[PDB]
């Protein structure tokens, strides 16, 4: 079937939910893949700091912070990025195939950390040789006038 809805107007049916929570997040792909829908949230009279997901997003946001931090240094020196190869194929048309993923994000958090250590140590422990070396050769040159 198909209704023009441009010589008319449409209507989307609401649905009552009593989904048990036991499929809470593993079922995320359910609507993440081809949800193609809108919601009427019921969470009212209570705010971010008062609700639950605020807590984890507080740990999350840090990863984006450090990522955009990296981006500057990455573009800094001489090199480009291949761009998201997934973006060409992973977001391929409209698919039910979106590969599953559960907790791996936390593994990503720890790994991006371990990295951020690498990055901080590198940047802050390489950014000094310059000046002390420079003054050292400066004095060396000064030595030449000792005759």
């Amino acid at each position: 079937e198909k209704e023009e809805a441009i010589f008319r107007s449409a209507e989307m049916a609401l649905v009552q939910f009593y989904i048990p929570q036991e499929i809470s997040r593993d079922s995320a792909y359910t609507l993440g893949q081809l949800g193609l829908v809108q919601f009427r949230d019921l969470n009212s009279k209570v705010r971010a700091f008062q609700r639950t997901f605020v807590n984890e997003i507080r740990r999350l946001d840090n990863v984006e912070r450090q990522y955009r931090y990296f981006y500057s240094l990455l573009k800094k020196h001489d090199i480009k990025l291949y761009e998201g190869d997934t973006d060409k194929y992973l977001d391929g048309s409209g698919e039910l195939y979106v590969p599953p993923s559960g907790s791996v994000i936390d593994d990503y958090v720890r790994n991006a950390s371990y990295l951020e250590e690498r990055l901080i140590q590198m940047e802050d422990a390489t950014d000094q040789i310059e000046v002390q070396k420079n003054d050292l050769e400066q004095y060396r040159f000064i030595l030449q006038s000792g005759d």
């Binding site: 599953p100 422990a125 390489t126 002390q132």
Partner: protein, 312 residues
């Protein structure tokens, strides 16, 4: 008891518990066992008879290494059987262990096989796994049995997921029944490693002559907190570690040599002159030419230390 004594030893029954490519048989073999071994009477005795079929469990879980939602051959998979099998397996395996002797033995028996057991939830989990996946390691560390303070060391050393193990904790889960123990896990798991007496253990392993990365030392803020006591000790056995440093074949020892040299970063320059007893710059230079990445990463830090410290 005598009835089950007959029922235990068989020939084909072992096959009924061996069909692993086809999972129909062991399934019941062990669901009925679960409903069986509830009472200690049969629990202990039957454990005294089946100490070779753990590989059953091992496959029942190791399969998940490669998995995909809409793949493999199963019809009506886990509405009641597909991973209800895993539910059985895990619940029985932990359930039975509550005689302190049981886990006390099994841990030393198959440390490693239950090492990656941590991976059970490293990536994937579903509803009923939560309460149990690590609720055995709960028992593997409880303060009621021998070696309840002896082996988990290596568990942590090879795992290192501890930060991500915490990362499992925060994401709230619907059930109360699991937040207490999961918190308990980390709290106890921190009150010993941070308490892992540094110079005691350090000098012990040093005088041993055999060494591993021993990443405790590199985690060093609390170790530098009393590095002055190392200056007291003056680490002349580190003068010996120099002798160790000329010739090396263990990647761990070779790289930790550089790491040990390098911790000066948080240590006062009053160590700089005792270093000045050293200082032939071609030494760690030729070492720098040893470019093996696995060590080279921190070999950069090592060779770099001298000059930025000059900045320091």
């Amino acid at each position: 008891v005598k009835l089950v004594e007959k029922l235990l030893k068989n020939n084909n029954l072992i096959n009924i518990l061996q069909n692993i490519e086809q999972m129909d048989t062991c399934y019941v073999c062990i669901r009925l066992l679960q409903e069986l071994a509830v009472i200690p009477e049969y629990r202990d005795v039957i454990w005294l008879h089946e100490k070779k079929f753990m590989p059953t469990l091992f496959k029942i879980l190791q399969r998940a290494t490669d998995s995909q939602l809409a793949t493999r051959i199963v019809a009506t998979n886990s509405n009641h059987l597909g991973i209800q099998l895993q539910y059985h397996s895990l619940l029985l395996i932990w359930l039975l262990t509550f005689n302190p002797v049981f886990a006390n033995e099994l841990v030393q028996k198959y440390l490693s096989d239950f090492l990656d057991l941590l991976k059970l939830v490293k990536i994937t989990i579903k509803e009923k796994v939560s309460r149990l996946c690590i609720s055995i390691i709960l028992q593997c560390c409880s303060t009621r049995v021998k070696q309840h303070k002896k082996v988990i060391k290596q568990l942590l050393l090879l795992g290192n997921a501890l930060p991500t193990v915490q990362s499992l904790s925060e994401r709230k889960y619907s059930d109360e029944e699991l937040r207490q123990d999961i918190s308990n896990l980390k709290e106890i798991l921190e009150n010993e490693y941070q308490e892992l007496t540094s110079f005691d253990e350090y000098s012990s392993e040093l005088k041993s002559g055999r060494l591993e990365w021993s990443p405790v030392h590199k985690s060093e803020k609390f170790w530098r907190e009393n590095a002055v006591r190392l200056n007291e000790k003056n680490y002349e056995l580190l003068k010996i570690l120099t002798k160790l440093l000329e010739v090396s074949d263990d990647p761990q020892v070779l790289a930790v040599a550089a790491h040990d040299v390098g911790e000066y970063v948080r240590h006062y320059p009053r160590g700089k002159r005792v270093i000045e007893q050293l200082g032939g710059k071609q030494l760690v230079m030729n070492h720098m030419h040893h470019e093996d990445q696995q060590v080279r990463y921190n070999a950069l830090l090592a060779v770099q230390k001298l000059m930025v410290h000059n900045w320091e």
